[PDB]
Design a protein around this ligand. Structure first.
Ligand code: GTP
Ligand code: G1I
Lengths: 284, 54, 237, 331
């Protein structure tokens, strides 16, 4: 009934996440023109989103539908590790893209020297290493584990796989994953908006008599989708640790799954250029 | 003036040329193409054993 | 087998070439190229010499940014088949003599200005220069003032459109010179903005014989060109 | 009065040519079976050029080739192994043509600077610099190991002497810019196509014009020469390629389509002379049937316009250069 319907929506969503990302990766793959210094960060983002779509979503869907974790405890730990790694590696790439755009617009004469194909690989490797250092290391080891009796019972049992964590890790992971890569993006996009407004004013002053909406719309959509998708969960995460019993498990799980959706939208937002559309028309 | 004259000397020079009917020229071209037809690897795909770009 | 030595030699040679190709590609991407173009009696040589203080090339650097300019003089031809080679430059520098309006021949040519306007219209609508901006230097601004103020000749005699024109502005002077200057500049702005389509613009300027700040203007205009291109690429303009 | 005097002769020439028109080449070639579809797959792709490519010329052994780009560089490739051999910096970065000597010892290049420069491969330093033209160069072909013929933008073509550096013969008669030339197999005569929509036949030994063909309407950008030695094909800006004839002295066939409105930048034949390959500005090439005037295939894969084309001496492969800074080998 309701269970079957939810199952249908879920199955329908895993598909979109896989399809968009595989389509994006193939085109950079099948065409010389697309490759470029800015198009490697999109490749990293697509790879992270594809990994999450293949690994995290289906097992979580099975856990929700079957109401019990059939797999072993070790596989539960591995699933949590993959979840945290993908989520924390799919946001710092957005921060890197924002910084790249900031450098491209603010410093037009020094863009060529500052960014080179050799430095892009180093930046991407560093980002993925920082993502993995805060996901596998404290989770494969038992440094996050809680202390209350329910947590001990869940950890000892091999049937249930739930998420229990203490204050230190719940704050550190949130700060590393969300809060730091947000103020950077806000500052960058504010500067870009100022530059765009100044250039539009200069054009109007120069030739207004003979003859800011697009910039506002683009910045609004780019910031709004990400902030709406990932903002509530990363405040619920801290709140449910600071104060007990305020946040039920259902609300936490629902707001967590809301964040999972955002990986579907990234192809729609970052691949609306004419070159990508022509490439998409070329194959399939 | 002389340059104007020149265009006269050149026009006179090319005026007297013996010309054959286009039927003979077409026949010669077709005969050449039909004679050297089999020695065109571009027209006839040769086996990959002899192809240096495979 | 045993030829296995030559192959290895070719493989080494390819890498030896590729390293230098990358090293030179860095410098090639670093620099900016400009094209200097102007009609006769415009004052191109004087402007080039002041900025300094087949093809002829000059290199200058401003704030550690390398600029490279080419003036192609060769010899005169209305057909300009070689201009398709200059479709990857940053900008085109156009120099026009502002004070040579009442100069009928240079014959029975249209006043020389009209010839300059026709040349600019031809440059603007070319198929291969669809995304190249133009930096306009309206040269000889003192002779124009001399001809306008206390001058028997009038613009309306040669250009009938001047009769029904009013100033638009940044006067710096006399009331007549401002009207004359702005009419002349608008005569080019109209052509530039008729079919721009938003991919390339024009930046008119007012130079003289003793001006010293042309290089700074070129630097600023190139920076604006690059910034506007980048803004339009990401759908922000 | 002299100007008026000339036409009576032009009318006589036109009348004689009209009299010589016994039939149509299409009418005679009516029972010829079609060649059918022709498919070509890219075999090799050459990278390394930092900017657009304007010229290339296959080596005499159908193994090596040279290419010129607008970053000021010539690169001598190796088709079989796709690895470079030489990289030559240039004094002037605007080059519009290149050539490769039949003996494989020298390579020449020239451009907006009105100077033709040759290089010594087996020694890479400049051997001789030739000057005297008052306009940019369009093409240059090694007639031998000691003398070369060039065509420039001052409506003239000249025959040079490498040892001395001075012009031996000068060919005059065109009105507009000269854009291409091609040599006969015996290097006894050569043709040239100009921007006044006219092609002329010269005699190298003497230095006088023999014939003239004026069938086109716009500028001529490319010209090739039939393998037999009695015909040549031209490509103009009006999306038409024509095939003339030296003995009959007028055109025989025209290759055009209603769905093509772009220009032509290169023309080449095949070893047997049955096919005619032409490069277009629509970012792709076409293959024609010489004796039936029908498209027989397309060669797509270039992201920008094609500015060069050539076919190996043994007729095994065809190479294309484009503004996308890439070279491809088809087969
Ligand atoms: N008053 C004034 N005269 C100038 C200026 N620039 C050039 N000229 C005049 O131009 C004449 C020749 O100098 P150039 O302008 O360098 O050379 P040109 O005659 O412009 O030659 P082209 O630029 O090739 O047409 C001089 O006699 C100057 O009087 C200027 O800024 N002010
Ligand atoms: C099991 N779901 C996890 C739980 C905690 C967490 C997530 C994502 C990013 C983080 O920085 C986290 O701390 C969620 O995906």
């Amino acid at each position: 009934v309701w269970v079957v319907g939810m199952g249908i929506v879920m199955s329908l969503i895993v598909l979109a996440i896989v399809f968009g990302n595989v389509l994006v990766i193939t085109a950079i793959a099948k065409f010389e023109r697309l490759q470029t210094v800015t198009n490697y960060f999109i490749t990293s983002l697509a790879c992270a989103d594809l990994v999450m779509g293949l690994a995290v979503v289906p097992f979580g869907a099975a856990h929700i539908l079957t109401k019990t974790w059939t797999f072993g405890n070790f596989w539960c730990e591995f699933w949590t590790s993959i979840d945290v790694l993908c989520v924390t590696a799919s946001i710092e790439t957005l921060c890197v893209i924002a910084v790249d755009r900031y450098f491209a617009i603010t410093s037009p004469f020094k863009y060529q020297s500052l960014l080179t194909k050799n430095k892009a690989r180093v930046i991407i490797l560093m980002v993925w290493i920082v993502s993995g250092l805060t996901s596998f290391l404290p989770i494969q080891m038992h440094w996050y584990r809680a202390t209350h009796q329910e947590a001990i019972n869940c950890y000892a049992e091999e049937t249930c796989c739930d998420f229990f964590t203490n204050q230190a890790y719940a704050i550190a992971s949130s700060i590393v994953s969300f809060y730091v890569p947000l103020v950077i993006m806000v500052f960058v996009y504010s500067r870009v908006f100022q530059e765009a407004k100044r250039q539009l004013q200069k054009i109007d002053k120069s030739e207004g008599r003979f003859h800011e909406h697009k910039a506002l719309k683009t910045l609004g959509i780019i910031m709004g989708t990400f902030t709406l998708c990932w903002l509530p969960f990363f405040i619920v995460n801290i709140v449910h640790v600071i104060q007990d019993n305020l946040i039920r498990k259902e609300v936490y799980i629902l707001l967590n799954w809301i964040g999972y959706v955002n990986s579907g939208f990234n192809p729609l937002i970052y691949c609306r250029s004419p070159d990508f559309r022509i490439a998409f028309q070329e194959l399939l | 003036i002389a340059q104007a004259r020149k265009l006269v000397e050149q026009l006179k020079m090319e005026a007297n040329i013996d010309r054959i009917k286009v039927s003979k020229a077409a026949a010669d071209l077709m005969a050449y193409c039909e004679a050297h037809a089999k020695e065109d690897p571009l027209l006839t795909p040769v086996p990959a054993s002899e192809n240096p770009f495979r | 087998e045993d030829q296995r030595n030559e192959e290895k030699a070719q493989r080494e040679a390819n890498k030896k070439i590729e390293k230098q190709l990358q090293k030179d590609k860095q410098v090639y991407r670093a620099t900016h190229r400009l094209l200097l173009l102007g009609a006769g009696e415009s004052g191109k040589s004087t402007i080039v010499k002041q900025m300094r203080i087949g093809i002829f090339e000059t290199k200058f650097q401003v704030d550690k940014v390398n600029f490279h300019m080419f003036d192609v003089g060769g010899q005169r031809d209305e057909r300009r088949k070689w201009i398709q080679c200059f479709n990857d430059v940053t900008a085109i520098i156009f120099v026009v003599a502002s004070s040579s309006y009442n100069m009928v021949i240079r014959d029975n040519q249209t006043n020389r200005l009209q010839e300059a306007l026709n040349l600019f219209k031809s440059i603007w609508n070319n198929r291969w220069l669809r995304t190249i901006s133009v930096i306009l230097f309206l040269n000889k601004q003192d002779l124009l003032a001399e001809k306008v103020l206390a001058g028997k000749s009038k613009i309306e005699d040669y250009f009938p459109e001047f009769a029904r024109y009013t100033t638009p502005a940044t006067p710096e002077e006399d009331p007549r010179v401002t009207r004359a200057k702005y009419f002349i500049r608008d005569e080019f702005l109209r052509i530039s903005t008729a079919s721009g389509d938003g991919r390339h613009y024009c930046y008119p300027h007012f130079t003289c014989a003793v001006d010293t700040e042309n290089i700074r203007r070129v630097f600023n205009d190139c920076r604006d060109i690059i910034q506007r291109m980048h803004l339009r690429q990401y759908e922000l303009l | 009065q002299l100007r008026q005097e000339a036409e009576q002769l032009k009318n006589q020439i036109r009348d004689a040519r009209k009299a010589c028109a016994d039939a149509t080449l299409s009418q005679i070639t009516n029972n010829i079976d079609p060649v059918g579809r022709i498919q070509m797959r890219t075999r090799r792709t050459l990278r390394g050029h930092l900017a657009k490519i304007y010229a290339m010329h296959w080596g005499t052994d159908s193994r090596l080739l040279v290419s010129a780009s607008q970053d000021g560089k010539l690169i001598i490739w190796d088709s079989y192994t796709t690895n470079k051999v030489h990289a030559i910096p240039l004094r002037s970065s605007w080059v519009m043509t290149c050539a490769y000597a039949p003996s494989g010892n020298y390579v020449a290049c020239g451009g907006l600077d009105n100077i033709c420069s040759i290089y010594n491969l087996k020694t890479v330093r400049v051997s001789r610099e030739l000057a005297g033209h008052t306009g940019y160069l369009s093409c240059c072909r090694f007639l031998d190991d000691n003398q070369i013929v060039t065509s420039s933008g001052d409506t003239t073509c000249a025959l040079w002497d490498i040892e001395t550096g001075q012009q031996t013969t000068t060919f005059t008669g065109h009105t507009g810019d000269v854009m291409s030339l091609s040599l006969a197999p015996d290097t006894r005569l050569f043709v040239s196509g100009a921007c006044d929509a006219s092609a002329k036949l010269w005699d190298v030994r003497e230095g006088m014009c023999r014939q003239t063909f004026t069938g086109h309407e716009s500028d001529i950008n490319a010209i090739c020469f039939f393998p037999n030695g009695n015909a040549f094909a031209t490509g103009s800006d009006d999306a038409t390629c024509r095939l003339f004839d030296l003995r009959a002295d007028q055109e025989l066939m025209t290759y055009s389509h209603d769905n093509i409105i772009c220009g032509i930048t290169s023309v080449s034949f095949s070893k047997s002379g049955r096919l005619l390959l032409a490069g277009y500005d629509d970012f792709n090439c076409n293959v024609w049937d010489a004796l039936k005037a029908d498209r027989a295939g397309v060669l797509a894969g270039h992201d920008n316009r094609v500015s060069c084309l050539g076919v190996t001496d043994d007729g095994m492969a065809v190479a294309t250069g484009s503004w996308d800074s890439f070279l491809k080998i088809w087969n």
